[PDB]
Design a protein around this ligand. Structure first.
Ligand SMILES: [Ca+2]
Ligand SMILES: [Ca+2]
Ligand SMILES: [Ca+2]
Ligand SMILES: [Ca+2]
Ligand SMILES: [Ca+2]
Ligand SMILES: [Ca+2]
Ligand SMILES: [Ca+2]
Ligand SMILES: [Zn+2]
Lengths: 60, 318
């Protein structure tokens, strides 16, 4: 499992959908449209293609 | 507890002469320090700790045991901003300012960008969990809200992440002055978030007015960052060096500017930009009142120069 931060279009992204690729939500930002998620390392590819997903960034 | 001294850096940034005007104890003003946490019961700090929060591992906690400093770095930085002016220990640049201690770094003094971004969000939201309660677009400086007016980040890294930048943009749009360490690698330019245009990059000088060799270059301003005595756990004091120690001197000067301005005018100043050289903006004021060391003008070692609180406050109130 790795921690990544996803930048999303709120109107088009569903946080429940991260379970579908084996991940879970850690924190949903109140001030920016982004969410911290834990996903399997091999799932970063799939996450990138999810509905409403604009960017996936590694935790630095 | 030892008898109070004024550390050399506090004298250097010309803070003591400001105190008769303000010590920063204007009720709408808070400084959020995003660091390793705080020794919240330290006798030379306690009275100024207004809120203690932790964002470690992406969970927000206001539990004292989660927000307590396990490293020392946060306690040291906070003491340079806000150590009390009394009979003991040391004294901060703004010895009456309220502090929000936001723990984004762990026992190691290491932290994730995710936890840092959450920390910035907590500084904007404040204890009430809402950025703009009355919906008027005024956040920093609105006495109806509880947002911080200064975010102080004695930390940095090499990555420029989009979400972290978006969070910096949100703080900047809330009217918050953002101050961050240039970094300690002797690099040609500052670390992030210092390197963002919305953020004041702070380099370190020593007590001879020489730039520290470790100090990352092209800062916006510089400040005392070598042989800095401050508070340290548990209820003690320690001397350290780094751009992490320079940062809080600048954050304190900002806190005095905004406190004095609100005390006189019932508003705060706009944050301003890197290029600003007017008296109409916090950063403009910092730049024109800084002690211009090295070559004339902004230079890659000192930035615009060493911050000076006494002159900055006079420029603000003039
Ligand atoms: Ca405030
Ligand atoms: Ca203590
Ligand atoms: Ca003291
Ligand atoms: Ca609030
Ligand atoms: Ca408001
Ligand atoms: Ca208001
Ligand atoms: Ca110069
Ligand atoms: Zn997890």
């Amino acid at each position: 499992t790795i921690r990544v931060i996803v930048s999303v279009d709120k109107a088009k992204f569903n946080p429940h959908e991260v379970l579908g690729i084996g991940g879970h939500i850690v924190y949903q930002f109140k001030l920016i449209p982004a969410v911290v998620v834990d996903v399997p390392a091999n799932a970063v590819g799939k996450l990138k293609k999810m509905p409403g997903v604009e960017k996936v960034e590694f935790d630095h | 507890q030892p008898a109070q001294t004024i550390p050399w850096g506090i004298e250097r940034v010309k803070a003591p002469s400001v105190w008769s005007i303000t010590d920063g104890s204007v009720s709408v003003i808070q400084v959020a320090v995003l660091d390793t946490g705080v020794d919240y019961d330290h006798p030379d700090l306690a009275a100024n700790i207004a809120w203690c929060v932790s964002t470690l591992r992406g969970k927000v906690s206001t539990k004292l045991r989660d927000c307590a400093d396990q490293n020392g770095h946060g306690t040291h930085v906070i003491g340079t901003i806000a150590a009390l002016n009394n009979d003991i220990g040391v004294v901060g640049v703004a010895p009456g300012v309220q502090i929000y201690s936001v723990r984004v770094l762990d026992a190691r003094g290491s932290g994730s960008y995710s936890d840092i971004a959450i920390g910035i969000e907590q500084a904007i939201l404040g204890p009430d969990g809402v950025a703009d309660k009355d919906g008027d677009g005024i956040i920093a400086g609105d006495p109806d809200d509880d947002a911080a007016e200064v975010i102080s980040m004695s930390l940095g890294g090499p990555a420029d992440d989009s979400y972290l930048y978006d969070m910096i943009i949100q703080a900047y749009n809330a009217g918050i002055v953002i101050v961050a360490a240039s970094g300690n690698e002797g690099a040609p330019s500052p670390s992030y978030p210092a390197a963002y245009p919305e953020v004041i990059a702070v380099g370190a000088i020593d007590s001879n007015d020489n730039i520290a060799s470790f100090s990352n270059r092209q800062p916006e301003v510089s400040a005392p960052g070598v042989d800095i005595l401050s508070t340290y756990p548990d209820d003690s004091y320690e001397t350290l060096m780094g751009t992490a120690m320079a940062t809080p001197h600048v954050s304190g000067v900002v806190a005095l500017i905004q406190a004095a301005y609100y005390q006189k005018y019932g508003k705060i100043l706009p944050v301003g930009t890197f290029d600003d050289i007017s008296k109409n903006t916090v950063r403009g004021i910092l730049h024109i009142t800084a002690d211009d060391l090295g070559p004339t003008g902004w230079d890659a070692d000192y930035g615009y120069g060493v911050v000076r609180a006494a002159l900055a406050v006079q420029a603000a109130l003039g």
